[PDB]
């Protein structure tokens, strides 16, 4: 009951259960179907602590549907599910039975999308989408401001649909080049003026802590299941199950490729697309086994439409290796013997499927 | 080789140390009202978020970066709501440049510290520089050098044992003062960072866990020590406040408070001493400021309305008392309170009295 849940919180039982669920999440790192090289293993436990931090903002600090606020569910030091390094992610908990206004300045970032989601990794292992809005339907006011309404009730203007079970808004700002693009500056509020928040309720905290702990276990399990499923096509980059990518919170404009890779120090993975389709954005990123992008603050581990130089015939080649071969487009393996990799077409009517092959890195340096 | 980490033992010990920290909330010398109790467990989770940034994510002295060690949703040791705090891990054997825009915020201080709560329960200071001595370039930019080797210009001292830089930007008026925009880098830059070292993560996770346990224990020890003078506001032991990472320009008062719904705490200073800044804030028992995003729980030199004789009155109460300066108890029956004189040659000691809210 609710009485027991509140009693367990006040007594410290919930805190014990919270920490023990965190502890049990270590088994997702120790799984025998995951690589056990020291780097991957060490990064896996850091990954768990990173999921923790995200989980607590998600389910404890920014979980009041009467008082929504944005936080970042993936960024430079906390990462989930092939986090797009070219994205500013913003997430707010909402209540699908209420109505919300998202306001602020549009900025100059060219790609901007708004998804409402329900469930959650901690609940159903999913982030099923309930509504969506991007530039195709967005109306920008003359003054450069943004006015967006989230509601289960149809509204005029920039309306993003919710269902009663909707519980999150996930914003993607996708940068061609963060140095020259300005992010949209968005705030979220409840439409009807809210009285000051009530004091922290033991029952609500009991639920937030357990959801946070279960988020760590389920999210790590979810994407570890994905990474292990890629082993049969290691070092290739086949198209992903698109409906599955959407069901875990993907953006419906995006066509995904996910795989795992494995390279010795003297090997390189050569990725080729013969043509580049008409699209709004594309990129490819290198990840560790836990599907965290590698550390793009310090390594070149993502190449996109803005930074990838095409070949003479219009194709694009991208090389995964320990050092750059000549002036080719390059993904730095950054000390990793193995990891995962993600390619995105955004807004492509006809995706073009990359081919891959493994060669000796010396063969590319001599030839280039 | 990091045997404990690679096997999962460190992760288990990390979680089990976190679990035992719940005893700092359940201590019988701490209040057991449900609000204080529930906030205590959220507080532990907030401490863990700070601890992981401090000891896991931003703990490489070769690749320093600022993060916030107290903000709107994670708070330590009577966090000043009028502060923008920034913290970076550094290595006292190396040299660092802090650059960026000075902005117009009048109070800006830089402290270098050693040890840490997770280690000795302390944050002893090793160097200090504030805005009064700083030299700003023509383009409004500022350059500050941290080093154990004496330097000309804007030099902040370090010792070999120095491991942290703590920046305070203290705002009189956030509407008219602009924050400094600062970044930190190591001067003798080397090759791109190495991949994660399992040994360093092994140490970082255990320090993060011990940070949660020692930090909550430390300030719960402080809060319980105030019980003999509940609802008074005596001067604190200043050297003790400095030893846990205080700013040496600051004279602190710490206490606990306890009020029924129909009671108010009336605080008075007969005069306001000449100073650069002063404020008073209302906290919960865990010495987190109350939620100033939605409640008026801090009054400072710029926003306090004075009395006619130049003195100031501040009232802690559940409902607004007339037009007096007000600290909102925000549903709390008990908590802690902190008063600051910053840069006052002669502190003036507030007096307190408990009255029925009807009298105001
Ligand atoms: Na992703
Ligand atoms: Na403080
Ligand atoms: Na602040």
Residues in helices of chain A, as a percent range: 25-40%
**Distance from first to last alpha carbon of chain A:** 68 Å
What is the CATH architecture annotation of the largest domain in chain A? Sandwich
Bound ligands: sodium ion
What structural class do you assign from the helix and strand content of chain A?
A: alpha+beta
CATH topology call of the largest domain in chain A = Jelly Rolls
CATH class of the largest domain in chain A: Mainly Beta
> What's the overall geometry of chain A?
globular
Number of domains of chain A: 2
Strand order of the largest sheet of chain A: 1-7-3-4
Number of strands of chain A: 16
Pair of chains with the largest interface and how many residues each contributes: A-B, 51 and 51 residues
Report the sheet-strand fraction of chain A: 25-35%
Describe this structure in words.
2 copies of one chain form a homodimer. Chain A has 2 domains: 222 residues, Jelly Rolls (Sandwich), CATH 2.60.120; 138 residues, Domain of unknown function DUF1214, C-terminal domain (Jelly Rolls, Sandwich), CATH 2.60.120. Helices cover 26% and strands 28% of the residues of chain A. The first copy, chain A, contains 8 helices and 16 strands. In chain A, the strands form 4 sheets. The first copy, chain A, has a 4-stranded antiparallel β-sheet with strand order 1-7-3-4, with no helix packed on it. Chain A has a 4-stranded mixed β-sheet with strand order 6-5-2-8, with no helix packed on it. In chain A, helix 1 packs across helix 6. At the A-B interface, helix 1, helix 2, helix 3, helix 4 and helix 6 of A face helix 2, helix 3 and helix 5 of B. One sodium ion binds next to loops of chain A. Chain A: This is DUF1214 domain-containing protein.
């Amino acid at each position: 009951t609710d009485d027991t849940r509140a009693t367990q919180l006040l007594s410290g039982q919930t805190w014990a259960d919270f920490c023990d669920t965190l502890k049990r999440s270590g088994e997702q790192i120790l799984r025998t179907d995951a690589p056990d090289d020291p780097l991957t293993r060490a990064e896996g436990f850091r990954y768990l602590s990173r999921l923790m931090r995200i989980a607590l903002e998600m389910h404890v600090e920014f979980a009041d549907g009467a008082w929504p606020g944005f936080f970042s569910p993936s960024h430079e030091t906390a990462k989930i599910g092939a986090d797009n390094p070219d994205n500013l992610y913003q997430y707010a908990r909402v209540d699908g039975r209420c109505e919300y206004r998202v306001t602020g300045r549009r900025g100059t970032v060219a790609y901007l999308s708004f998804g409402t989601q329900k469930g959650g990794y901690e609940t159903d292992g999913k982030m099923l989408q309930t509504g969506f809005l991007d530039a195709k339907q967005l109306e920008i006011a003359p003054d450069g401001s943004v006015e967006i309404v989230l509601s289960a009730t149809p509204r005029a203007g920039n309306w993003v649909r919710m269902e009663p079970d909707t519980n999150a808004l996930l914003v993607r700002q996708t940068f061609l080049d963060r140095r020259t693009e300005t992010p949209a500056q968005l705030k979220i509020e409840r439409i009807d003026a809210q009285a000051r928040p009530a004091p922290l309720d033991p029952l609500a905290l009991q639920g937030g802590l357990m959801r946070a702990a279960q988020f760590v276990e389920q999210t790590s399990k979810l994407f570890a299941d994905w990474a292990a499923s890629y082993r049969p096509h290691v070092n290739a980059l086949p198209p992903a199950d698109q409906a599955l990518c959407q069901s875990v919170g993907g953006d419906p404009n995006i066509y995904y490729y996910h795989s795992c890779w494995s390279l010795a120090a003297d090997e390189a993975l050569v990725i080729d697309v013969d043509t580049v389709p008409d699209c709004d954005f594309w990129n490819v990123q290198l990840n560790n086994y836990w599907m965290e992008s590698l550390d793009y603050r310090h390594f070149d581990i993502c190449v996109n439409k803005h930074s990838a130089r095409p070949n003479a015939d219009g194709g694009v080649t991208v090389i995964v290796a320990a050092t750059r071969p000549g002036s080719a487009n390059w993904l730095d393996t950054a000390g990793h013997r193995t990891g995962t990799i993600c390619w995105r077409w955004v807004g492509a009517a006809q995706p073009v499927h990359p081919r891959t092959r493994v060669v000796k890195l010396a063969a590319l340096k001599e030839a280039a």
